[PDB]
């Protein structure tokens, strides 16, 4: 009830994806409900997702952390890049300020250049707006 299966089961409940993948472990966090709108201000009402993701990654205290930000097709490519970079960068500062040592972390912004769905449809672009958190 304080363990891995409990905290991944309620991150399913507050709708953040997790993937187990060999050594690579990746949280997919929707920016649409974990950020206030088109901003790098964190959605402060959704704190228990943020406490639960940092409670999850106390379990891996030696892995380097890749954090990356994603948008969809709207706006200029500069706006895509700087908005994704700003949101990934402030999630990186959230993990640093909730206590991960700063040379484990890596913030990087992609203006939907990985694009896990198509941007031509509404729900697919909603899935494209995200933060990936990878570690080893």
């Amino acid at each position: 009830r304080d363990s891995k299966r409990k905290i991944i089961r309620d991150l399913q409940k507050q709708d953040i994806q997790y993937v187990e993948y060999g050594d690579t472990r990746t949280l997919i966090i929707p920016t649409d409900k974990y950020f206030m709108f088109s901003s790098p201000r964190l959605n402060e009402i959704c704190y228990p997702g943020l406490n639960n993701v940092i409670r999850l990654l106390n379990f891996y205290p030696q892995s380097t952390i890749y954090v990356a930000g994603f948008t969809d097709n709207v706006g200029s490519r500069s706006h895509k890049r700087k908005l994704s970079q700003a949101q990934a960068e402030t999630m990186m500062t959230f993990l640093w300020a909730n206590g991960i040592a700063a040379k484990r972390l890596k913030a990087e912004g992609y203006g939907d250049k990985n694009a896990i769905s198509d941007n031509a449809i509404i729900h697919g672009s909603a899935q494209n707006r995200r933060i990936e958190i990878q570690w080893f």
């Binding site: 031509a120 449809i121 509404i122 729900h123 697919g124």
Partner: protein, 70 residues
């Protein structure tokens, strides 16, 4: 419909229905990419049935007689 993932959340136009886990397999609108491959019409793939006729035969709008539907 969108069964056992959750209930159907939205109905995304230019798509199928959107369940409250993922995208469903049930078509939302008429204009989605539903795999029609067998039509059911008189004089399909020639032009349509020229509706002004009142006789025995059925004439297409490309002036073929639909002998399979007369």
């Amino acid at each position: 419909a969108a069964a056992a993932a959750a209930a159907a959340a939205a109905a995304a136009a230019a798509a199928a229905a959107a369940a409250a886990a993922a995208a469903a397999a049930a078509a939302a609108a008429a204009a989605a990419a539903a795999a029609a491959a067998a039509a059911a019409a008189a004089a399909a793939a020639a032009a349509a049935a020229a509706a002004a006729a009142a006789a025995a035969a059925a004439a297409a709008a490309a002036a073929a007689a639909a002998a399979a539907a007369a």
